[PDB]
Amino acid sequence: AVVLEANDVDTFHVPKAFYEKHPSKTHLKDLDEYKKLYDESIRSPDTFWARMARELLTFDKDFQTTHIGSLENGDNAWFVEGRLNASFNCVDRHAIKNPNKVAIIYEADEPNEGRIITYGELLREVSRVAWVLKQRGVKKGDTVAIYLPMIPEAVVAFLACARIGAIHSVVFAGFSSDSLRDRVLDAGSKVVITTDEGKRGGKVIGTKRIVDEALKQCPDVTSVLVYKRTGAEVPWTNGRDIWWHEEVEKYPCYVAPESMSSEDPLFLLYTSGSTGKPKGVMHTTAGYLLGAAMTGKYVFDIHDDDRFFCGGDVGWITGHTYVVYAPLLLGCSTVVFESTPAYPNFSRYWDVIEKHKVTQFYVAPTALRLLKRAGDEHIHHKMEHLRILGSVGEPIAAEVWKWYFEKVGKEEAHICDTYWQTETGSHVISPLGGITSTKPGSASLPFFGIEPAIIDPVSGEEISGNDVEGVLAFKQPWPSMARTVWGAHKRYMDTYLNVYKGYYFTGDGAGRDHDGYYWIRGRVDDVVNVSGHRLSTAEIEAALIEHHQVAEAAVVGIADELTGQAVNAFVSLKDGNETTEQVRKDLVMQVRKSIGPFAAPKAVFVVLPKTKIMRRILRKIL
Ligand SMILES: CCCOP(=O)(O)OC[C@H]1O[C@@H](n2cnc3c(N)ncnc32)[C@H](O)[C@@H]1O
């Protein structure tokens, strides 16, 4: 009984109403077909992933070799001779079948201020922005920084970069000017797409003013594409800044999509790591797109006429994979939500679902716990078409699971706790919608092409059998796996492939129970997740140490109901001219200037245990 977190927890089947209220049948017949297809995906993956790639993707030129490389050397290449384009698979091929089919369902910050975009309209707007970038010097292989909020213009900026072969480096709207500047210089981006101002939950985000303050140290940026979101008077540097609505009307509504290799870099997504500077994880085209289409088809049970809603932001891989690519690849409607879960009221999430007849909802448990405390007077909507409920970022608690199952799902929808990371590109351990039975707090079985292993951290040896515990690792590579860390492959190898040779190291502790289910126990390294943002404790410590009156700094993350994790900072202060309260206030703002407002610590305590600072003694006292 080594796995104590699985003691007495029971299996939860798919509700009988799921099958009764289903428009069609699910993609897999039963649980055995999963096992049959899963064992095929790990025994002979070369034949498996080849059949899947041609069913879900349409290539310019066919491929011959499914996979070469290994995890030992970090030289993985998938579908090496194939050629394709991301914009074609997301827009063009669906617009060819029927251009009047809905692609994007835009729900603006204020209710009843959105719009509905068809695949034909999406192809035109993507083609126009593609032309604007081409006429601004964007060539194949260049990087473009996307500093946009959750407006439909963000999805257009994604595929416009992919249509011409550019590499889009999306920066979460709300990072400080210093964070944006660093992500621009590291990727060498010469073009940046942004808005004049942002509108989230009634508050205004001065995006354009942040970009201006960031570009003061980014000289190589020569083009800024600004979209008029609020129309407020914003600083304008002429010759460099250009208005979206002005430049868009100059160029044709169609452009030919650049043929890309399977292993051409598709995008960069900068992810905070265990140490040093935030590193830009890279994903190629064919493998990543196949990962998104596969998980959408089998985890979320996405069909043609479905309406998909993911609460994640585009600044995160959740919005990358499941707001943009996975739904559009499969040809359904994706909901682009610009507001907060509690604006103007706590029923907003469900207001959108009922209005747009959403079939699949994807939320973080941190947002569920906040709405659960508010009261059940807000969730009185029928939400008749809600079929798959998804959680991400943390294991869903048994009490939160029941609320998600009864109030939202009406005891008729399948809850899927999906475990994955930015470097996985898509779900790796998750239940299959309408197939896999679940356990509250467990991520259920692994996905196709995911061979998980429990590793003894001290011994570095794999622990076989069930009812085992250790750290989580993958034995063989999968198509969606990240290919490198931009500008630092050595850092990529040491972080993910040199910890346990022949394995991919997730950086999480895990356990496997008697039934074979997996239980994610959280990060092993110095990494925390606050409000959906992945932060490094070492990075926050460096910002605090920069203060002239901070001798040393120590930051540790503990559990928190409001934001998943809470960053608590221990600081040592020399004598100074201003009091501790002023320094305490000045220490929080200093972190906001380096990283952002969300990186602000919950509390700072002027105090230092050492032998090497013991993080455990600092956490346990809290
Ligand atoms: C994909 C969400 C955002 O991705 P990021 O790369 O920012 O963070 C991934 C990490 O979030 C946790 N995590 C994510 N999903 C779960 C999950 N379902 N259960 C437990 N922990 C989870 C795991 O520690 C993981 O290494």
PDB file of C-alpha atoms in Angstrom, residues 439-570:
ATOM      1  CA  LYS A 439     -10.451   8.610  -9.683  1.00  0.00           C
ATOM      2  CA  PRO A 440     -10.592  12.016  -7.931  1.00  0.00           C
ATOM      3  CA  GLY A 441      -7.023  13.269  -7.788  1.00  0.00           C
ATOM      4  CA  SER A 442      -5.657  10.841 -10.395  1.00  0.00           C
ATOM      5  CA  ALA A 443      -4.750  11.500 -14.032  1.00  0.00           C
ATOM      6  CA  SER A 444      -5.843   7.938 -15.019  1.00  0.00           C
ATOM      7  CA  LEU A 445      -3.882   6.048 -17.720  1.00  0.00           C
ATOM      8  CA  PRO A 446      -1.263   7.370 -20.164  1.00  0.00           C
ATOM      9  CA  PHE A 447      -1.993   8.610 -23.662  1.00  0.00           C
ATOM     10  CA  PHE A 448      -0.931   6.963 -26.914  1.00  0.00           C
ATOM     11  CA  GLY A 449       2.823   6.935 -27.394  1.00  0.00           C
ATOM     12  CA  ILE A 450       3.403   7.723 -23.706  1.00  0.00           C
ATOM     13  CA  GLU A 451       5.267   4.953 -21.864  1.00  0.00           C
ATOM     14  CA  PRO A 452       5.567   6.219 -18.274  1.00  0.00           C
ATOM     15  CA  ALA A 453       8.107   4.997 -15.757  1.00  0.00           C
ATOM     16  CA  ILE A 454       8.453   5.421 -12.008  1.00  0.00           C
ATOM     17  CA  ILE A 455      12.081   6.099 -11.098  1.00  0.00           C
ATOM     18  CA  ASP A 456      13.766   5.809  -7.710  1.00  0.00           C
ATOM     19  CA  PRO A 457      15.322   9.298  -7.391  1.00  0.00           C
ATOM     20  CA  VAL A 458      18.201   8.160  -5.164  1.00  0.00           C
ATOM     21  CA  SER A 459      18.893   4.967  -7.142  1.00  0.00           C
ATOM     22  CA  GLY A 460      18.073   6.350 -10.597  1.00  0.00           C
ATOM     23  CA  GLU A 461      16.490   2.961 -11.308  1.00  0.00           C
ATOM     24  CA  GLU A 462      13.033   2.259 -12.691  1.00  0.00           C
ATOM     25  CA  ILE A 463      10.543   0.790 -10.221  1.00  0.00           C
ATOM     26  CA  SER A 464       8.357  -1.800 -11.934  1.00  0.00           C
ATOM     27  CA  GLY A 465       4.891  -3.057 -11.068  1.00  0.00           C
ATOM     28  CA  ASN A 466       1.969  -1.318  -9.431  1.00  0.00           C
ATOM     29  CA  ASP A 467       1.672   0.297  -5.991  1.00  0.00           C
ATOM     30  CA  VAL A 468       5.009   2.069  -6.478  1.00  0.00           C
ATOM     31  CA  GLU A 469       6.147   5.639  -5.868  1.00  0.00           C
ATOM     32  CA  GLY A 470       8.898   7.922  -7.147  1.00  0.00           C
ATOM     33  CA  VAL A 471       9.452  10.491  -9.901  1.00  0.00           C
ATOM     34  CA  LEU A 472       7.735  10.488 -13.291  1.00  0.00           C
ATOM     35  CA  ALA A 473       9.563   9.819 -16.559  1.00  0.00           C
ATOM     36  CA  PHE A 474       8.839   8.616 -20.093  1.00  0.00           C
ATOM     37  CA  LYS A 475      10.739   5.734 -21.666  1.00  0.00           C
ATOM     38  CA  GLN A 476      10.377   6.506 -25.392  1.00  0.00           C
ATOM     39  CA  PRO A 477       9.711   9.715 -27.340  1.00  0.00           C
ATOM     40  CA  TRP A 478       6.352  10.872 -28.671  1.00  0.00           C
ATOM     41  CA  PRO A 479       5.619  13.151 -31.656  1.00  0.00           C
ATOM     42  CA  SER A 480       4.431  16.128 -29.591  1.00  0.00           C
ATOM     43  CA  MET A 481       7.635  16.218 -27.501  1.00  0.00           C
ATOM     44  CA  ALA A 482       9.521  19.510 -27.429  1.00  0.00           C
ATOM     45  CA  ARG A 483      12.523  19.468 -29.747  1.00  0.00           C
ATOM     46  CA  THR A 484      14.970  21.889 -28.087  1.00  0.00           C
ATOM     47  CA  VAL A 485      15.406  25.007 -25.967  1.00  0.00           C
ATOM     48  CA  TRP A 486      16.073  27.939 -28.295  1.00  0.00           C
ATOM     49  CA  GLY A 487      19.709  29.064 -28.131  1.00  0.00           C
ATOM     50  CA  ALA A 488      20.546  26.447 -25.495  1.00  0.00           C
ATOM     51  CA  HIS A 489      20.361  22.786 -26.489  1.00  0.00           C
ATOM     52  CA  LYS A 490      22.871  21.921 -23.755  1.00  0.00           C
ATOM     53  CA  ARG A 491      20.452  23.344 -21.184  1.00  0.00           C
ATOM     54  CA  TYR A 492      17.713  21.331 -22.905  1.00  0.00           C
ATOM     55  CA  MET A 493      19.675  18.082 -22.560  1.00  0.00           C
ATOM     56  CA  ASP A 494      20.652  18.670 -18.923  1.00  0.00           C
ATOM     57  CA  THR A 495      17.138  19.648 -17.849  1.00  0.00           C
ATOM     58  CA  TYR A 496      15.121  16.933 -19.621  1.00  0.00           C
ATOM     59  CA  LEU A 497      17.393  14.153 -20.941  1.00  0.00           C
ATOM     60  CA  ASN A 498      20.570  13.976 -18.807  1.00  0.00           C
ATOM     61  CA  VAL A 499      18.855  13.419 -15.432  1.00  0.00           C
ATOM     62  CA  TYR A 500      18.028   9.761 -16.197  1.00  0.00           C
ATOM     63  CA  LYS A 501      19.669   8.674 -19.458  1.00  0.00           C
ATOM     64  CA  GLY A 502      17.227   7.089 -21.887  1.00  0.00           C
ATOM     65  CA  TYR A 503      14.274   8.795 -20.179  1.00  0.00           C
ATOM     66  CA  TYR A 504      12.465  12.110 -20.475  1.00  0.00           C
ATOM     67  CA  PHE A 505      12.282  13.658 -17.000  1.00  0.00           C
ATOM     68  CA  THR A 506       8.990  15.444 -16.306  1.00  0.00           C
ATOM     69  CA  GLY A 507      10.279  17.015 -13.090  1.00  0.00           C
ATOM     70  CA  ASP A 508       7.273  15.751 -11.110  1.00  0.00           C
ATOM     71  CA  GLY A 509       6.907  13.203  -8.371  1.00  0.00           C
ATOM     72  CA  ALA A 510       4.322  10.541  -9.072  1.00  0.00           C
ATOM     73  CA  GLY A 511       2.907   7.221  -7.959  1.00  0.00           C
ATOM     74  CA  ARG A 512       1.171   4.291  -9.622  1.00  0.00           C
ATOM     75  CA  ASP A 513      -1.588   2.531  -7.711  1.00  0.00           C
ATOM     76  CA  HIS A 514      -2.794  -1.075  -7.628  1.00  0.00           C
ATOM     77  CA  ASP A 515      -5.119  -0.438 -10.595  1.00  0.00           C
ATOM     78  CA  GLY A 516      -2.311   1.153 -12.629  1.00  0.00           C
ATOM     79  CA  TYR A 517      -3.563   4.738 -12.309  1.00  0.00           C
ATOM     80  CA  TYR A 518      -1.071   7.581 -11.952  1.00  0.00           C
ATOM     81  CA  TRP A 519      -1.050  10.215  -9.199  1.00  0.00           C
ATOM     82  CA  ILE A 520       0.872  13.444  -9.835  1.00  0.00           C
ATOM     83  CA  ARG A 521       2.544  14.653  -6.634  1.00  0.00           C
ATOM     84  CA  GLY A 522       3.875  18.016  -7.828  1.00  0.00           C
ATOM     85  CA  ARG A 523       7.219  19.430  -8.897  1.00  0.00           C
ATOM     86  CA  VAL A 524      10.486  18.012  -7.568  1.00  0.00           C
ATOM     87  CA  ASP A 525      12.582  21.021  -8.598  1.00  0.00           C
ATOM     88  CA  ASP A 526      12.301  24.663  -7.475  1.00  0.00           C
ATOM     89  CA  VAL A 527       9.274  25.488  -9.632  1.00  0.00           C
ATOM     90  CA  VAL A 528       5.800  26.643  -8.561  1.00  0.00           C
ATOM     91  CA  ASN A 529       2.536  27.444 -10.348  1.00  0.00           C
ATOM     92  CA  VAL A 530       0.567  30.519  -9.241  1.00  0.00           C
ATOM     93  CA  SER A 531      -2.752  31.390 -10.934  1.00  0.00           C
ATOM     94  CA  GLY A 532      -1.847  29.325 -13.980  1.00  0.00           C
ATOM     95  CA  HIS A 533       1.586  30.958 -14.264  1.00  0.00           C
ATOM     96  CA  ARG A 534       4.672  28.761 -13.944  1.00  0.00           C
ATOM     97  CA  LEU A 535       7.377  30.540 -11.939  1.00  0.00           C
ATOM     98  CA  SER A 536      10.875  29.789 -10.680  1.00  0.00           C
ATOM     99  CA  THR A 537      11.624  30.429  -7.018  1.00  0.00           C
ATOM    100  CA  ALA A 538      15.249  31.141  -7.959  1.00  0.00           C
ATOM    101  CA  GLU A 539      14.096  33.784 -10.453  1.00  0.00           C
ATOM    102  CA  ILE A 540      12.036  35.588  -7.793  1.00  0.00           C
ATOM    103  CA  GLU A 541      14.962  35.382  -5.351  1.00  0.00           C
ATOM    104  CA  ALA A 542      17.258  37.075  -7.879  1.00  0.00           C
ATOM    105  CA  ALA A 543      14.812  39.975  -8.248  1.00  0.00           C
ATOM    106  CA  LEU A 544      14.672  40.454  -4.470  1.00  0.00           C
ATOM    107  CA  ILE A 545      18.467  40.277  -4.115  1.00  0.00           C
ATOM    108  CA  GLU A 546      18.716  43.134  -6.633  1.00  0.00           C
ATOM    109  CA  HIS A 547      17.349  45.557  -4.022  1.00  0.00           C
ATOM    110  CA  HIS A 548      20.147  47.627  -2.501  1.00  0.00           C
ATOM    111  CA  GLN A 549      18.998  46.724   1.031  1.00  0.00           C
ATOM    112  CA  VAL A 550      18.429  42.971   0.486  1.00  0.00           C
ATOM    113  CA  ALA A 551      21.498  40.936   1.440  1.00  0.00           C
ATOM    114  CA  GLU A 552      20.006  37.479   0.808  1.00  0.00           C
ATOM    115  CA  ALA A 553      16.676  36.073  -0.332  1.00  0.00           C
ATOM    116  CA  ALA A 554      14.814  32.773  -0.142  1.00  0.00           C
ATOM    117  CA  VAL A 555      11.490  31.947  -1.813  1.00  0.00           C
ATOM    118  CA  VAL A 556       9.394  28.802  -1.317  1.00  0.00           C
ATOM    119  CA  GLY A 557       5.949  27.844  -2.592  1.00  0.00           C
ATOM    120  CA  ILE A 558       3.202  26.349  -0.441  1.00  0.00           C
ATOM    121  CA  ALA A 559      -0.311  25.230  -1.304  1.00  0.00           C
ATOM    122  CA  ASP A 560      -3.034  27.862  -1.573  1.00  0.00           C
ATOM    123  CA  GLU A 561      -6.753  27.572  -2.308  1.00  0.00           C
ATOM    124  CA  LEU A 562      -6.959  30.928  -4.104  1.00  0.00           C
ATOM    125  CA  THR A 563      -4.083  30.528  -6.581  1.00  0.00           C
ATOM    126  CA  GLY A 564      -2.930  26.889  -6.406  1.00  0.00           C
ATOM    127  CA  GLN A 565       0.426  27.860  -4.905  1.00  0.00           C
ATOM    128  CA  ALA A 566       1.580  30.857  -2.872  1.00  0.00           C
ATOM    129  CA  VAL A 567       5.067  32.365  -3.085  1.00  0.00           C
ATOM    130  CA  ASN A 568       6.487  33.268   0.331  1.00  0.00           C
ATOM    131  CA  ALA A 569       9.773  35.178   0.421  1.00  0.00           C
ATOM    132  CA  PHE A 570      12.341  35.291   3.231  1.00  0.00           C
TER     133      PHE A 570
END
